[PDB]
Short mmCIF file of C-alpha atoms and ligand atoms in Angstrom, two decimals:
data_model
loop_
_atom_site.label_atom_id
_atom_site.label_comp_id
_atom_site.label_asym_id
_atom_site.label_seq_id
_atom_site.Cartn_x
_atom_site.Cartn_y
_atom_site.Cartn_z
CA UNK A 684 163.06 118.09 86.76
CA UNK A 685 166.30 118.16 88.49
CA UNK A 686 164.23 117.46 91.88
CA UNK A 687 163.14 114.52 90.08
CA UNK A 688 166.61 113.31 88.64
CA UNK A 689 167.57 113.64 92.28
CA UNK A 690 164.96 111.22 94.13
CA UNK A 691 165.62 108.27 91.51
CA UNK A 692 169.73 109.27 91.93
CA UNK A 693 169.29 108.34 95.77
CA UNK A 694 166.62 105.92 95.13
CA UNK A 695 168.95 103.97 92.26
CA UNK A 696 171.85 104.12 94.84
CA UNK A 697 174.08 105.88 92.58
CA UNK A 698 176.39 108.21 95.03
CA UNK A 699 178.14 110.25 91.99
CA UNK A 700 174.78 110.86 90.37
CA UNK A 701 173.63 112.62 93.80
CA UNK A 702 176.64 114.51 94.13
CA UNK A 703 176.76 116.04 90.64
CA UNK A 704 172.54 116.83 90.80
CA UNK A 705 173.62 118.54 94.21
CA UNK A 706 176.07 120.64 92.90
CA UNK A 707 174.16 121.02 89.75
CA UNK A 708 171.75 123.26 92.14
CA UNK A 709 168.93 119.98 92.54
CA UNK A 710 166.38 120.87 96.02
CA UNK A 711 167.74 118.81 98.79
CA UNK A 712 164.55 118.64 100.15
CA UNK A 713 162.31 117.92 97.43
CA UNK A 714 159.24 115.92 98.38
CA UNK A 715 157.17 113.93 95.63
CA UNK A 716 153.22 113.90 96.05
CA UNK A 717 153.60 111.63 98.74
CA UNK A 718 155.69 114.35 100.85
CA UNK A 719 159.06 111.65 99.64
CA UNK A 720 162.11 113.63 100.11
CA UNK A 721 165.32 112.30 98.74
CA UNK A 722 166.57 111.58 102.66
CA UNK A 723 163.81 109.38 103.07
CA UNK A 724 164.43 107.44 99.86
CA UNK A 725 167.68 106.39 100.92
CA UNK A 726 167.08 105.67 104.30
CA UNK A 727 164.32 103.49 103.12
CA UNK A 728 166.61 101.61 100.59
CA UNK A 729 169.70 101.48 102.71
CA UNK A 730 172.37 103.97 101.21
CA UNK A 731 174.72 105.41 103.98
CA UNK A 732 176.67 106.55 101.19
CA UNK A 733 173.71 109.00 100.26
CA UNK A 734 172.33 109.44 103.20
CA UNK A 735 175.80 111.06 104.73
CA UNK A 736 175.85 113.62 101.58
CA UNK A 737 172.11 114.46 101.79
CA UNK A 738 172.34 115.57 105.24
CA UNK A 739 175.76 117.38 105.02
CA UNK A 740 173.96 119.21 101.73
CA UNK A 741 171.17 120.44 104.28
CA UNK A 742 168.10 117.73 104.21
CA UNK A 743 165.77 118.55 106.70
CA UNK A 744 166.49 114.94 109.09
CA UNK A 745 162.76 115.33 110.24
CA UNK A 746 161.23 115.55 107.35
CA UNK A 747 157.51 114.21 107.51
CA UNK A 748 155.69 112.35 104.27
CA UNK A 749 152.06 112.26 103.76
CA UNK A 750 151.14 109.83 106.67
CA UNK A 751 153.67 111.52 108.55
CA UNK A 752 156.77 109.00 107.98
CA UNK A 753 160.34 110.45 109.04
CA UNK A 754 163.46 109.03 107.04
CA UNK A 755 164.20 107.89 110.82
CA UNK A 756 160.72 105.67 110.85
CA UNK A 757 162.17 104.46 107.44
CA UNK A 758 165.16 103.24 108.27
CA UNK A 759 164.12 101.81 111.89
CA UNK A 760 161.23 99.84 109.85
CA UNK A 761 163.85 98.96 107.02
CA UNK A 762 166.63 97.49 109.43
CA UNK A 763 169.27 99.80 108.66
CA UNK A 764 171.32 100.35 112.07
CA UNK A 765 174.42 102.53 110.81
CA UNK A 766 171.62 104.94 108.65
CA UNK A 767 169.46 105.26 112.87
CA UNK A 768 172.51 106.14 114.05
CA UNK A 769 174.10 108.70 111.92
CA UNK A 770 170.08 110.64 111.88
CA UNK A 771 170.39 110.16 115.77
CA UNK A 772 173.18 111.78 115.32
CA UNK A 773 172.02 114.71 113.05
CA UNK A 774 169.48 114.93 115.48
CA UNK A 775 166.85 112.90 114.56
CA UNK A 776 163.09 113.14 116.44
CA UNK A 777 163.49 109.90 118.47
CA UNK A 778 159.81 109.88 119.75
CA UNK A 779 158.56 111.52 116.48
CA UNK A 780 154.81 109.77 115.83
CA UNK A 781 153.17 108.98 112.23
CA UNK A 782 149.89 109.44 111.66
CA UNK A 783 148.64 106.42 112.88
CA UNK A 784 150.73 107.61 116.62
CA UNK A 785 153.69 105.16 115.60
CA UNK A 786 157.37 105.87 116.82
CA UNK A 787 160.47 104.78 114.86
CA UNK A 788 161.06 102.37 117.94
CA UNK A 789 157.22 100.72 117.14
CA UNK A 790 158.37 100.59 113.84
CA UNK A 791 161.83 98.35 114.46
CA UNK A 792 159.49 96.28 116.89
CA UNK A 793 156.92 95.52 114.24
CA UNK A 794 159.64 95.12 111.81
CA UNK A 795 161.65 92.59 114.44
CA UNK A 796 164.70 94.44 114.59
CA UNK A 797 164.72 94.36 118.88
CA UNK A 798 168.93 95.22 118.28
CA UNK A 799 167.46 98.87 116.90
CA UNK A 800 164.76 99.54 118.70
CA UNK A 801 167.05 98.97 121.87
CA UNK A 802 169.36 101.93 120.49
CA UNK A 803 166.37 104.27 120.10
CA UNK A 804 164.85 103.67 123.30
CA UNK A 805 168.41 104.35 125.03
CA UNK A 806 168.38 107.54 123.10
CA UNK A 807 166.11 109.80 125.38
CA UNK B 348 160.41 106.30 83.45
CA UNK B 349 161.59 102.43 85.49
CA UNK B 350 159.42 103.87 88.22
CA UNK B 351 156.32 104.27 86.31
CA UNK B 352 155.73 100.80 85.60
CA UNK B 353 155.65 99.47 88.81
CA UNK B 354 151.92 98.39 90.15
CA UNK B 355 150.27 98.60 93.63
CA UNK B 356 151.57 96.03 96.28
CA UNK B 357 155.10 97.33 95.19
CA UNK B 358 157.66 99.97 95.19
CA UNK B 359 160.35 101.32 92.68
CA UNK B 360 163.79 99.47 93.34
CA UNK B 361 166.53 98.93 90.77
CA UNK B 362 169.28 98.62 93.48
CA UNK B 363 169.44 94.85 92.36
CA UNK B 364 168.79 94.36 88.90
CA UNK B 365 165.30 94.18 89.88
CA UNK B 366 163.01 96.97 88.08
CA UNK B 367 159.98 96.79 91.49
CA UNK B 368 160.13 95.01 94.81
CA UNK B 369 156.75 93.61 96.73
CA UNK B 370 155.65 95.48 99.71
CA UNK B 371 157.78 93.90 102.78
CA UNK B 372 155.55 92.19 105.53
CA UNK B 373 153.04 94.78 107.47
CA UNK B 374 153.26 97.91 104.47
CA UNK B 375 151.86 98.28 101.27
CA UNK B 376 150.89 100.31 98.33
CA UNK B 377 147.58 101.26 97.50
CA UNK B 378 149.00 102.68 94.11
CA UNK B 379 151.72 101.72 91.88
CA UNK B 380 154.66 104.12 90.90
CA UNK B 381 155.40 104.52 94.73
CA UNK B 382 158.72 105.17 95.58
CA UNK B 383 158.11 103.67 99.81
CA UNK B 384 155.64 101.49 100.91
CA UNK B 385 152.99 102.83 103.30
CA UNK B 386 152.77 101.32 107.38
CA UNK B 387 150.21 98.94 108.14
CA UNK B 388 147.74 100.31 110.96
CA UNK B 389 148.48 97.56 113.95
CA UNK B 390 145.05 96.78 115.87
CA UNK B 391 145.12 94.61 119.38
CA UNK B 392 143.56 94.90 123.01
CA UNK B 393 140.84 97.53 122.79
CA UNK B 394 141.67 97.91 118.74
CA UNK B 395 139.80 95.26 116.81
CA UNK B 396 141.02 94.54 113.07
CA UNK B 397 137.96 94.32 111.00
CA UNK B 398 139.34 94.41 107.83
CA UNK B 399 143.26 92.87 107.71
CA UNK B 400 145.99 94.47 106.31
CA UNK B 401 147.24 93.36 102.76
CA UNK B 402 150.12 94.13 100.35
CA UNK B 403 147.91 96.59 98.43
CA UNK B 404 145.58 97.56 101.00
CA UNK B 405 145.63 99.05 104.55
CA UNK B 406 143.64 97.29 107.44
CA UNK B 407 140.41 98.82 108.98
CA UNK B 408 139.82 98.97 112.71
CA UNK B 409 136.90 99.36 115.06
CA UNK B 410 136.97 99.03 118.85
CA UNK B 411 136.26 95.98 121.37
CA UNK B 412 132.83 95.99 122.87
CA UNK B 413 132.40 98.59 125.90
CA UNK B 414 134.37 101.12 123.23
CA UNK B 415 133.03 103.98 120.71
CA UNK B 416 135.54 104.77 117.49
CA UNK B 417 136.59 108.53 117.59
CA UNK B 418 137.92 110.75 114.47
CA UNK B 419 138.30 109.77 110.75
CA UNK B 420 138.86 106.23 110.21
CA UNK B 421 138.63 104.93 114.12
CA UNK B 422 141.98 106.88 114.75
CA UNK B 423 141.33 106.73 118.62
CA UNK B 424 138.67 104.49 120.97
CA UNK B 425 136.03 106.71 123.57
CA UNK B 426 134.68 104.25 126.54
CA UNK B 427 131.06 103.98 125.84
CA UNK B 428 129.00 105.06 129.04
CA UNK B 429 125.15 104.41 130.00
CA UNK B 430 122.46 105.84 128.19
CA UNK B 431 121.45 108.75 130.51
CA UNK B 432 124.79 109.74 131.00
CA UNK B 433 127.43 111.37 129.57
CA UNK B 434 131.32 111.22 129.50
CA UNK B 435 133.05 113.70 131.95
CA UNK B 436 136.91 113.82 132.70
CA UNK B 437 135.74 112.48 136.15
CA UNK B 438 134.23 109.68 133.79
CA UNK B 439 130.65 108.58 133.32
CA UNK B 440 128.36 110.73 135.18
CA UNK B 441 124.38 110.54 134.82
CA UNK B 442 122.65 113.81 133.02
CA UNK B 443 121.08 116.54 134.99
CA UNK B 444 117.59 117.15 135.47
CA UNK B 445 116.11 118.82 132.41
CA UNK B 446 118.68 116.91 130.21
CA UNK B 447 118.65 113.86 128.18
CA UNK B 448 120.72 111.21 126.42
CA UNK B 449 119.45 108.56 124.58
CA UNK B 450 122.75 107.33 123.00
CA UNK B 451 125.49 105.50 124.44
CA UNK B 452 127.73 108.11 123.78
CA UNK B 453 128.38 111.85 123.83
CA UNK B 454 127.07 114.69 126.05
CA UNK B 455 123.43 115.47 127.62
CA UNK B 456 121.50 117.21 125.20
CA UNK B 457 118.80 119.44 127.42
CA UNK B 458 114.54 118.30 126.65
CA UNK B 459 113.21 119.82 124.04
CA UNK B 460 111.09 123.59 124.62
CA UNK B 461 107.11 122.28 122.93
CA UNK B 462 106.46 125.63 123.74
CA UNK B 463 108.52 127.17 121.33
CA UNK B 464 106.65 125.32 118.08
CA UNK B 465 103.21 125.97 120.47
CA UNK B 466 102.77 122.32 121.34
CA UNK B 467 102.63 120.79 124.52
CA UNK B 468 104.34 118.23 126.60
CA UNK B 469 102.15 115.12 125.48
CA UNK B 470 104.69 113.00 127.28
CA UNK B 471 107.04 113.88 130.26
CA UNK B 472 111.13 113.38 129.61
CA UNK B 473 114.10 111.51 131.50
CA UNK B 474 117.59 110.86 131.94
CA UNK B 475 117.45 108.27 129.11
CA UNK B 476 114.85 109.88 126.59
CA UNK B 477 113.47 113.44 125.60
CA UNK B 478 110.43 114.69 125.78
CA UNK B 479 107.54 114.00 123.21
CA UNK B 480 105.34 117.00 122.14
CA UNK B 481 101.63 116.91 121.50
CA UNK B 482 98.83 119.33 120.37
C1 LIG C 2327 105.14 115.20 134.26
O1 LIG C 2327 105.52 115.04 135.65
C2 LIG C 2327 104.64 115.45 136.72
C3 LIG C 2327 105.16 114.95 138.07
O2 LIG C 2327 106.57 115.09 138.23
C4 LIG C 2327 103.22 114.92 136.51
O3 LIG C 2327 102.37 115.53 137.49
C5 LIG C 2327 102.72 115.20 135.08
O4 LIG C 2327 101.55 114.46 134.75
C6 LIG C 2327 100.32 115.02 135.21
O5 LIG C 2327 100.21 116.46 135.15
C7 LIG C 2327 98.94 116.97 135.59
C8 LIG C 2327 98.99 118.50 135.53
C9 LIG C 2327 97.79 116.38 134.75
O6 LIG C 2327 97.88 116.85 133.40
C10 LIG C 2327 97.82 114.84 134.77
O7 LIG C 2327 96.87 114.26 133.86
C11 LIG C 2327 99.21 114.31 134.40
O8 LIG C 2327 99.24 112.89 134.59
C12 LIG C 2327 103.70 114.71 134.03
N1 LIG C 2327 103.18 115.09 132.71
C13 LIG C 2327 102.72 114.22 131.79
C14 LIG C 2327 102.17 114.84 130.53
O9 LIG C 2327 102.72 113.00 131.93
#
């Protein structure tokens, strides 16, 4: 339930509400039946905020979903620069594949951000 | 509970006042209450999109002509080879003498042994076709 509370928290974008389920005890890493974990939930909607606290809490930054989706995939498919960088930075899988053999890069191409998929092809 | 109500072709969002959000170009959601939208399986050159993708449902894929779909759901493409051959890492090599395929794909299968059921070799086999038994 707290697991739960969590994933809408970081989905809602609501930074205190994360913080106080964290230190409440909440998983970190709690995946939904579609292998969601609160990390990729706000990479996928955009909150640096939460993404920042997730990671210093201990989220696992390589985290696969169901068809094998990485928070990084997320946020190189949702356009969010600043959220790439900082999971680059907390060492993000750069040539990580999905099921369907897709990189975060092939993601940020399909997705036309050329600007992103330019940093994650620098990085290795 | 906001989440719940959301149907397929959509994800849970109330960043913006809004309660859902449609599937952004090339993903979707086969059901509703999903929290991300699922990638859209891209199919060009020797991929060929059979069925498109939409905002509720993935696209299908076969391969081009020339090509043989491999694994669950096409997930790789095999070269088709001859029939009377099989596929070797060296590439497309014709089957050995008391071996058969009739396919255009997959390994020589050796003739089959009448002997073994008591009939006899009514007619002979090839390369391209096994043998037929008889009496
Ligand atoms: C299979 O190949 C043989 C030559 O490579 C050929 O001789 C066989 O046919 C003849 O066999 C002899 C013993 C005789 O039965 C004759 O009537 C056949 O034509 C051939 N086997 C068959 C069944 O065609």
């Amino acid at each position: 339930d707290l697991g739960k509370k969590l994933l809408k928290a970081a989905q809602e974008g609501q930074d205190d509400e994360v913080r106080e389920l964290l230190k409440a005890g909440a998983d970190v890493n709690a995946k939904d039946l579609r292998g969601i974990t609160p990390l990729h939930v706000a990479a996928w909607q955009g909150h640096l905020e939460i993404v920042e606290v997730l990671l210093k809490a201990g989220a696992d930054v390589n985290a696969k979903d169901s068809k094998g989706e990485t928070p990084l995939h997320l946020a190189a498919f949702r356009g969010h620069l600043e959220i790439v960088e900082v999971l680059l930075k907390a060492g993000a899988d750069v040539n990580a594949q999905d099921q369907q053999g897709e990189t975060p890069a092939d993601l940020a191409a399909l997705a036309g951000h050329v600007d992103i998929a330019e940093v994650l092809q620098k990085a290795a | 509970d906001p989440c719940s109500n959301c149907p397929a072709g959509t994800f849970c969002d109330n960043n913006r006042n809004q309660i859902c959000s449609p599937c952004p170009p090339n993903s979707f959601s086969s059901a509703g209450g999903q929290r991300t939208c699922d990638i859209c399986r891209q199919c060009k050159g020797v991929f060929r999109t059979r069925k498109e993708c939409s905002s509720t449902s993935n696209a299908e894929c076969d391969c081009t002509p020339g090509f043989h779909c491999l694994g669950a759901g096409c997930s790789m493409c095999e070269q088709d080879c001859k029939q009377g051959q099989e596929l070797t890492k060296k590439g497309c090599k014709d089957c050995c003498f008391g071996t058969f395929n009739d396919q255009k794909r997959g390994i020589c299968r050796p003739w089959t042994n009448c002997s073994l059921d008591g009939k006899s070799v009514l007619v002979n086999g090839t390369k391209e076709r096994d043998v037929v038994c008889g009496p």
